[PDB]
Design a protein around this nucleic acid. Structure first.
Ligand SMILES: O=P(O)(O)O[C@H]1[C@@H](OP(=O)(O)O)[C@@H](OP(=O)(O)O)[C@@H](OP(=O)(O)O)[C@@H](OP(=O)(O)O)[C@H]1OP(=O)(O)O
Lengths: 836, 195, 22, 20, 194, 49, 456
RNA sequence: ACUCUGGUUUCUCUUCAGAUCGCAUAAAUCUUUCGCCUUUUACUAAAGAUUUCCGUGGAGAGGAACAACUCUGAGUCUU
């Protein structure tokens, strides 16, 4: 037990991994198998999956993992070397992408999981991109190999064909996301593992070569581990592996020396269990008693495969030599994560992960207790050492060097490293490891840079947790009895803490609004809000979708705005951006930190913008990645550049906030270009203050937007469904009912299931996940995630459109129906006026 | 601070929730303000105006219905101008209004019998039935008819629109018939003529 | 046929109070 | 007839004898 | 007497947990039974027209059907007391029972979409050549050479994995004649077909 | 049982069982009288009820 | 640096700042960097560009704000610190700085304090706002106030931070919020002559869970029994502090001699042998009390023959006669009765008298409306102690400080409080915001429920 | 490949039962809430709390039958 702490002290025998993968792909069962390997007293039930890491009750009843769970375990390697493994088995549901990112910032390794009978799915398509964008080594473990044999009953050659088709599709798809050309995955190289979690089967080519070497002996398992995967074969007469076929009915090496023995052993334990089973266990050295042979087929298969393969050494040596150690992976993690990068003193102090250096651990999760009162933070100690009772300094997400007010000095109460259900109390946690810090819940929402007090003077914070999806769905929350409203404020704060992309908000009409990704996500968060944190009654409005406001054409007149003093006068024009330019802003392709020359060349080549304005672009919409843009287009002779540069900041401040709110209603402004045609600034810095410019800035922005023909943009969810070919029409009929349209219907190779990829309006996608399965009697299944935004049909600003109370309106009325009710939901005026 | 002025706001629950006066923030605040203004005038020792035993109905841009039980007649006034289309006469308990200055149908008063009157009539029938130790059948039925026309000539058009009152009337008449039939013989008959 | 009294709820489609009483 | 039925359903949501 | 259902995804909203939810909500699945309300709450049914549940603030695109409120009983409804959860979308087991008495047990039947293996792009991997610094011992062989890939009792054994509850047991206890509901899995089915 | 024996007249709850059995009949019959079987008194699947 | 001077100093409104609400962001539900606008009085998330405070400042044109943690003022639209001589007064409201001389010069204070709204008052004599059924909470908080031993431990913030708080300590918020509320009410200069316990009932309902919910009127005795216990337990982490600031003030040692099985079902000879058995006799049951309980005679239940419906007036000494060896009360429970006689062996500096008005019958709970005639400035308790202990105490005389009077039925109650302003003799009646200098006779006329004394 | 190893079946008695005792499912009584309500006996149909009923698992004890054919772990596991 103390060897756990001894290995904990070292920083090179430690791996930080995430077993990220699609929904229901065996990740939780894989961790359960690892636990069953380590802990002997923990034995899985004969039929019910134990689901060890599924510790909260809601995922124990719904059957889907919801929140990532830390697992700290010592795993022997193929050669028997112990390694300390930090496992963050992220939930697989695409609506739960919050926890994938939350566990991916604090990990250096990505262990993908792909169902052998399902192939690459929607989820994985985004996790490979995300992990590459976060600069982690990516490794694939095709799980549920049993499906190719006990369910599909494929010939072993076709099983290998399926395996290579799903292996190279990962390589082919990842080549778009990965700039480097060292990221080619192949089991012969050691990137790819093969496993069946239910039957505990797990191997890399090296491990299986180790089994053969163990049996026959005098075998070098490395050379034989190579020359297994591929189109090469084996010659029984010359005992050499050849590219060409040694016989007419030849067979690939992998199939011949790995897949075929698996087929035979599991067929012997599911067929002729009574006649030819002892014969095939004598030939394999697996000795069993009478009472362990009287079990059912599934437990017998799991036991026999545990005896044959043994411990999960294949996963261990797959992980060890193909993901960097924290001492090695710290440099890319820091240069992508720390705001100042490696260049700063603290940045250079991170490249080596010194256990005695400065402590600026990073926490990215909130694992509540069983009473829900206090929140135990979870984070990685990127460097330094932490102790129980140590007086520590917790930073925030708005904390900077200039803004020293966003921090708190706290006392680390206790420290313990956690493995799912049970936690191990430790007085000291060294660098490069994980920990649940206690007593730091008060000054944190979501991420935090918990660092030393009065010891890290110039230390900055870590970058905000950037996600892959966007919080789209929006639900109103109120107490049943307003006499217990404060009881619900703290519950909303708690759920905001325990959900990385949850966005609580109070609006002008005294409305509490919760933002989420999908139906199941909001179901889980409100179940937590009701039965866990607030233990009161809560009324919910039916889900509504956040909208966006855009333009399609230039304004008829150059509408302007002046300060109340009638001295400053700013004239601006709102026009749409080039198709695809908005995406090239949100993807961090271009930034405001760029120098002028690079952005000028970018807009001169890719978007053919004139250099007279390409070097006169101030801001990029709201926040930093906002899709809108502010453009300076005043001729220098009429607007003094020296005089302009004073309000150059305030105009942006009134613009970065001007586009955030939106004149039509309190919704984001997207895909709009603002050209300034005239500036009349006060010649003295006295009357041109921010309190006068900023209202004028927002007013001129709103006036230009309104005078330009405005439109609403609704977010479309990208829905994939997997159904047998008899139910493809049953998906077309459902998707046609909700204004959707199908993009592709591709059968999955090596499986009768299909994959129908379509788009569906988010406001029109409520219940579709149930409207499909019930219509197809549960055979079909859908997953949804936000893809893009589209102009809502119709003109949002027509007064001839009448909104009936309780029946859907046609497409042309939608743009009018959506905002007005939204306006009514916002508490604003019924219509829009040019004064706004 | 909590919008706690809606937790105890009395309302005419019998009407449908669209007909029932709607509890907007501004309207509830106005109603409570008006009631407080009225209550403050009267000295608390001379007399008092209890809110829980009172009803405030507000008609505004948000509420198109004005509700009140005047003398047992729960009336909902709904203007024709605001929310109406193709006004009719097929319902017998719906008073057409009339603007005397212009002589045009401008409002619509829906009539109803309040819960208090229905409960009072049911209790009257109950105390008729329980006070039948030796009373003749004729005495019981005379009391029943007198009680029936005591309200039916009083509540005339409202009875049509109060379906629960009709059900209660039929139930009580069946109770009277059952009482008489039990008075005749212990074992209730399978049929029994109205003659 | 039975002597039990049937509620005239839903039985008022074609009748008025003042009808058959002049 | 589906439209009228579904709108009606929306309005609904938001607003002795031994017989064998 | 056995439906040929391999998984339980066909029982999406006809599980007994979903029926417990429907009972506790006084709501009925179209194929499900009706129950008396757990709590009358007639006054709570007669909730007033507030600024929260105001119609003019609500966007209606597709009606919130009962099964929506049953699948997500903490999102689409209020006051979910004594409610149970079920979303057990077990990965829909892709099993193809054999029909040919004579066929290889592991056969690539046409019900499976072909893999369509390709070699168009030279996506090569580290591979050896002939007689390149490697040699295999004469003793070493694949583990199971003598035993056939599939016996006669292989297809039956594999098809026996996805049999109903009574027929996936190699051994088990004895039940009474009373306690065996033969048509239990008949009215538990989704609906009767017309 | 109700038609053949008037036991329901001596314990009303039995109607449940009565109705239960009849419901079971319907379940088995519609599954029994399928295809070319036709309608008639030819079902003896009594263990259900 | 234009930080020191501001052209927006006059826009501040001092009568609108109501600092008794929860210090959490209104817009986005956070406690971090809680910044309060001074023009209108709303809470925000903090400084920074495009921040909620910044958005409000550039929208409402409200410039000068306030920091609730650093207590340093800011102008957000340009975001620079603000320092002014007059503005300091505002900082004295939310965080009153009661230096030790002000504590030492407060029992000798006889000047009516000034409020910004003009509502005159005396410190300590302050109306606690009844937001929702806080009558009992306001009553117990006011009665716990005006206790100089407890008064001199919470007016300074540097008294209760040094205590050890375990990692599982979830009740220190009670102590710190009690201290802060006491500083708010004891404030010589505040904008409002009242104060809202809105920040205090939240800590009460967090520490006591759903119990003592502000929805329903709580029980005073049941309240302070838990409240003093919680104050005692919070002060001291993982260390048995048998004597803390509240224990050596109200707790007193008490002797009980208890005999059992006097049950009438036993015959005379069997009971004689039982008392002869030497197993069932008076026992050494000395323990501690946080407050002395007073048991009243039952209501007359009958009209007096001459003056009908006579009001039952009983002298206090008859009630206090319970605490001596002469009298013994039968606290019968379950099968066998228990005859207990009480005795006092250590008088606390301040003696609390809880009064058992509300009691459950066999069927329904009623109240005992028996008036008590009790003095307020002269009482002797020397007869209730053994002489082997009487020599230790040279002060057995107590003077009334606070009194609790209840109204009506248990389910419909409205507490009222009689507070004595020390130094003077003005007895003031506070229900929610009431202030009235009553005479020393209306204290006797009303029926008392909880009394606070002082041994001097 | 040497050893000691040593029964399962069956019928009872006595207790303990966590667990779908039971991959099945009845009845009664009581307290609430409806429905009916004309009094019991039947009910009504949900809730809660009980009890009996048809069964069950485990442990132990006592007989009987295969009690003596075996058999299992242990071992030094002896060319
Ligand atoms: O009313 P059901 O119970 O459904 O059954 C009656 C009928 O006689 P019973 O009324 O006495 O049952 C037959 O039912 P069995 O006598 O066979 O039980 C008949 O069934 P067959 O056509 O198989 O003879 C048919 O029952 P079903 O409609 O279930 O086939 C029919 O029903 P209806 O009289 O209601 O049409």
């Amino acid at each position: 037990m103390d060897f756990l702490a001894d290995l904990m002290d070292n920083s090179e025998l430690i791996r930080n991994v995430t077993l990220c993968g699609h929904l229901h792909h065996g990740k939780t069962c894989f961790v359960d198998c690892l636990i069953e390997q380590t802990h002997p007293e923990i034995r899985k039930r004969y039929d019910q999956d134990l689901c060890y890491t599924d510790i909260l009750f809601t995922e124990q009843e719904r059957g889907v993992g919801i929140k990532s769970t830390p697992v700290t375990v010592v795993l022997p390697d193929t050669k028997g070397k112990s390694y300390l493994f930090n496992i963050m088995d992220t939930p697989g549901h695409v609506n739960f992408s919050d926890e994938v990112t939350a566990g991916l910032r604090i990990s250096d390794g990505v262990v993908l999981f792909i169902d052998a009978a399902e192939g690459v799915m929607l989820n994985t398509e985004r996790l490979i991109k995300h992990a590459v964008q976060e600069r982690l080594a990516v490794t694939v473990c095709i799980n549920k190999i049993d499906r190719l044999i006990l369910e599909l009953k494929l010939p072993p050659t076709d099983a290998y064909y399926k395996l290579r088709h799903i292996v190279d599709e990962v390589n082919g798809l990842i080549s778009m996301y990965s700039t480097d050309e060292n990221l080619i995955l192949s089991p012969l190289l050691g990137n790819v593992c093969f496993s069946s979690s239910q039957y505990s089967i797990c191997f890399t080519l090296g491990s299986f070569a180790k089994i053969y070497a163990d049996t026959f002996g005098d075998i070098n398992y490395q050379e034989f581990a190579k020359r297994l995967w591929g189109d090469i074969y084996f010659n029984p007469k010359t005992r050499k592996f050849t590219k060409k076929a040694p016989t007419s009915s030849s067979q690939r090496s992998f199939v011949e020396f790995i897949l075929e023995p698996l087929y035979k052993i599991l067929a012997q334990v599911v067929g002729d269990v009574d006649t030819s089973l002892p014969r095939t266990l004598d030939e394999l050295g697996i000795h069993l008693t009478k009472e362990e042979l009287k079990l059912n087929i599934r437990p017998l298969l799991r036991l026999v495969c545990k005896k044959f393969f043994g411990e999960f050494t294949g996963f261990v040596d797959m992980c060890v030599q193909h993901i960097p150690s924290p001492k090695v992976g710290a440099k890319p993690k820091i240069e992508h994560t720390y705001t100042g990068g490696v260049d700063s003193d603290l940045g250079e102090a991170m490249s080596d992960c010194d256990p005695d250096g400065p402590l600026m651990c990073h926490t990215t999760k909130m694992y509540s207790t069983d009473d829900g009162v206090q929140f135990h933070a979870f984070g990685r100690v990127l460097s330094g050492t932490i102790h129980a009772g140590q007086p520590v300094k917790v930073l925030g997400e708005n904390y900077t060097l200039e803004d020293e007010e966003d921090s708190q000095i706290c006392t680390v109460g206790r420290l313990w490293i956690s493995v799912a259900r049970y936690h191990i109390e430790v007085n000291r946690v060294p660098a490069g490891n994980w920990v649940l810090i206690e007593g730091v819940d008060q000054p944190i929402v979501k991420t935090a840079t918990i660092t030393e007090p009065r010891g890290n003077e110039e230390a900055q914070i870590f970058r905000p947790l950037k996600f892959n999806t966007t919080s789209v769905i929006k639900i109103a929350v109120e107490p049943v009895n307003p006499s217990e409203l404060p009881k619900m404020l703290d519950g909303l704060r708690k759920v905001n803490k325990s959900y990385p992309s949850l966005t609580t908000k109070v609006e002008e009409s005294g409305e509490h609004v919760i933002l989420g990704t999908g139906e199941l996500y909001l179901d889980c968060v409100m179940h937590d809000l009701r039965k866990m944190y607030s233990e009161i009654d809560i009324k919910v409005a039916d889900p509504v979708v956040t909208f966006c406001e855009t333009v399609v054409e230039t304004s008829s007149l150059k509408c302007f705005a002046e300060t109340p003093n009638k001295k400053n006068k700013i004239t601006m024009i709102a026009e749409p951006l080039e198709k695809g330019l908005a995406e090239d802003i949100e993807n961090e392709v271009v930034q405001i930190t760029w120098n002028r020359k690079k952005l000028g060349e970018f807009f001169q080549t890719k978007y053919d913008w004139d250099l007279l304005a390409a070097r006169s672009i101030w801001a990029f919409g709201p926040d930093a990645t906002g899709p809108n843009i502010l453009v300076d287009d005043t001729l220098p002779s009429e607007v003094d550049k020296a005089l302009l540069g004073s309000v150059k900041d305030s105009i942006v401040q009134g613009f970065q906030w001007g586009t955030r709110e939106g004149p039509l209603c309190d919704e984001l402004i997207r895909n709009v270009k603002f050209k300034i045609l005239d500036a009349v600034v006060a010649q003295e810095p006295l009357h041109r203050g921010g309190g006068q410019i900023i209202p004028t800035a927002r007013r001129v922005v709103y006036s230009a937007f309104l005078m330009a023909t405005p439109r609403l943009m609704e977010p479309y969810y990208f829905v994939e469904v997997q159904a047998p070919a008899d139910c493809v029409s049953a998906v077309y009929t459902v998707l046609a009912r909700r204004r959707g349209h199908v993009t592709q219907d591709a059968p999955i190779p090596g499986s009768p299931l299909y994959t129908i990829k379509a788009f569906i309006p988010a406001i029109d996608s409520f219940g579709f996940e149930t409207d499909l399965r019930t219509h197809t009697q549960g055979q079909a299944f859908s997953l949804s995630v936000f893809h893009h935004w589209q102009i809502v049909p119709g003109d949002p600003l027509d007064k001839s459109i009448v909104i009936r109370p309780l029946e859907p309106q046609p497409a042309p009325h939608l743009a009018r129906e959506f905002m007005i009710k939204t306006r009514r939901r916002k508490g604003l005026s019924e219509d829009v006026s040019i004064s706004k | 601070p909590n919008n706690e002025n809606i937790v105890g706001y009395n309302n005419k629950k019998c009407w449908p929730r669209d007909a029932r006066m709607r509890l907007m923030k501004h309207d509830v605040n106005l109603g409570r303000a008006v009631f407080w203004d009225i209550k403050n005038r009267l000295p608390r020792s001379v007399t008092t105006v209890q809110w829980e035993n009172s009803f405030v109905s507000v008609y505004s841009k948000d509420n198109p219905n004005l509700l009140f039980n005047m003398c047992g007649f729960e009336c909902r006034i709904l203007p024709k101008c605001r929310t109406s289309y193709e006004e009719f006469t097929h319902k017998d308990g719906v008073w057409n209004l009339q603007n005397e200055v212009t002589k045009e149908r401008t409002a619509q008063c829906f009539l109803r019998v309040d819960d208090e009157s229905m409960q009072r009539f049911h209790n009257r029938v109950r105390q008729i039935l329980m006070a039948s130790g030796s009373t003749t059948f004729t005495k019981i039925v005379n009391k029943w008819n007198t009680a029936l026309i005591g309200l039916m000539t009083y509540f005339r058009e409202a009875v049509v629109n109060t379906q629960e009152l009709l059900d209660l009337l039929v139930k009580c008449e069946n109770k009277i018939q059952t009482r008489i039939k039990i008075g005749l013989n212990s074992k209730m008959p399978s049929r029994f003529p109205p003659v | 046929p039975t002597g039990e009294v049937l509620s005239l709820v839903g039985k008022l489609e074609g009748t008025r109070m003042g009808d058959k009483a002049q | 007839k589906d439209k009228s039925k579904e709108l009606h359903a929306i309005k609904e949501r938001y607003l002795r004898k031994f017989v064998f | 007497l056995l439906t040929d259902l391999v998984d339980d995804n066909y029982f999406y909203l006809f599980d007994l947990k979903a029926f417990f939810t429907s009972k506790a909500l006084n709501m009925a699945i179209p194929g499900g039974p009706k129950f008396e309300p757990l709590v009358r709450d007639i006054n709570l049914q007669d909730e007033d027209w507030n600024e929260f549940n105001d119609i003019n603030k609500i966007i209606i695109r597709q009606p919130i059907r009962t099964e929506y409120k049953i699948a997500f009983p903490y999102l689409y409804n209020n006051l979910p007391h004594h409610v149970h959860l079920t979303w057990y979308h077990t990965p829909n087991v892709v099993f193809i029972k054999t029909e040919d008495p004579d066929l290889p047990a592991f056969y690539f039947d046409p019900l499976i979409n072909p893999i369509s293996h390709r070699h168009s792009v030279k996506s090569q991997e580290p591979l050896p050549d002939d007689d390149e610094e490697f040699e295999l011992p004469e003793f070493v062989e694949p583990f199971l050479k003598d035993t056939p890939l599939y016996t006669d009792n292989t297809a039956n054994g594999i098809a026996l994995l996805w049999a109903p509850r009574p027929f996936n047991l190699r051994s088990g206890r004895t039940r009474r004649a009373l306690d065996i509901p033969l048509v239990k899995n008949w009215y538990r089915e989704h609906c009767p077909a017309g | 049982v109700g038609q053949l024996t008037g036991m329901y007249r001596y314990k009303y709850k039995l109607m449940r069982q009565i109705r239960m059995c009849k419901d079971l009949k319907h379940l088995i019959y519609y599954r029994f009288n399928t295809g070319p079987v036709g309608k008639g008194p030819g079902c003896g699947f009594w263990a259900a009820g | 640096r234009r930080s020191r001077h501001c052209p927006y100093l006059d826009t501040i409104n001092r009568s609108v700042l109501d600092f008794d609400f929860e210090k959490l962001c209104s817009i986005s539900l956070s406690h971090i960097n809680a910044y309060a606008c001074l023009v209108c009085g709303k809470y925000f998330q903090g400084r920074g560009l495009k921040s909620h405070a910044y958005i409000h400042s550039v929208q409402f044109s409200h410039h000068v704000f306030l920091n609730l943690h650093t207590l340093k003022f800011y102008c957000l639209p340009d975001n620079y610190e603000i320092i002014d001589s007059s503005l300091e007064d505002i900082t004295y409201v939310l965080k009153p700085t009661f230096t030790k001389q002000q504590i030492a010069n407060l029992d000798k204070q006889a000047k009516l304090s000034r409020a910004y709204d003009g509502t005159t008052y005396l410190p300590g004599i302050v109306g606690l706002n009844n937001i929702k059924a806080n009558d009992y909470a306001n009553a117990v908080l006011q009665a716990l106030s005006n206790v100089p031993p407890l008064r001199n431990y919470f007016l300074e913030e540097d008294n209760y931070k040094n205590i050890k708080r375990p990692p599982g300590d979830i009740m220190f918020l009670l102590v710190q919020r009690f201290g802060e509320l006491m500083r708010k009410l004891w404030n010589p200069r505040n904008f409002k002559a009242h104060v809202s316990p809105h920040e205090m009932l939240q800590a009460v309902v967090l520490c006591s869970k759903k119990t003592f919910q502000i929805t329903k009127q709580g029980d005073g005795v049941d309240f302070l029994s838990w409240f003093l216990n919680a104050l005692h337990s919070a002060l001291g982490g993982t260390k048995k502090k048998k004597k803390t600031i509240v224990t050596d003030v109200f707790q007193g040692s008490m002797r009980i001699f208890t005999k059992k099985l006097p049950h009438p079902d036993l015959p005379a000879e069997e009971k004689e042998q039982l008392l002869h058995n030497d197993e069932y006799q008076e026992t050494m049951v000395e323990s501690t009390f946080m407050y002395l309980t007073l048991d009243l005679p039952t209501a007359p239940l009958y009209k007096d023959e001459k003056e009908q419906l006579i009001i039952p007036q009983v002298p206090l000494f008859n009630i206090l006669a319970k605490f001596n060896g002469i009298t013994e009360k039968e606290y019968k429970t379950y099968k066998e009765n228990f005859l207990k006689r009480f005795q006092l062996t250590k008088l606390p500096p301040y003696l609390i008298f809880c009064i058992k008005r509300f009691t459950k019958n066999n069927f329904f709970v009623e109240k005992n409306p028996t008036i008590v005639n009790f003095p307020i400035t002269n009482v002797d308790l020397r007869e209730y102690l053994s002489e082997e202990v009487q020599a230790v105490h040279k002060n057995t005389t107590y003077d009334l400080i606070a009194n609790i009077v209840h109204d009506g039925k248990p389910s419909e109650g409205s507490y009222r409080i009689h507070v004595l302003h020390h130094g003077t003799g003005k007895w003031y009646e506070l229900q929610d915001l009431q202030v009235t200098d009553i005479l020393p006779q209306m204290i006797t006329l009303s029926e008392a429920y909880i009394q606070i004394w002082k041994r001097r």
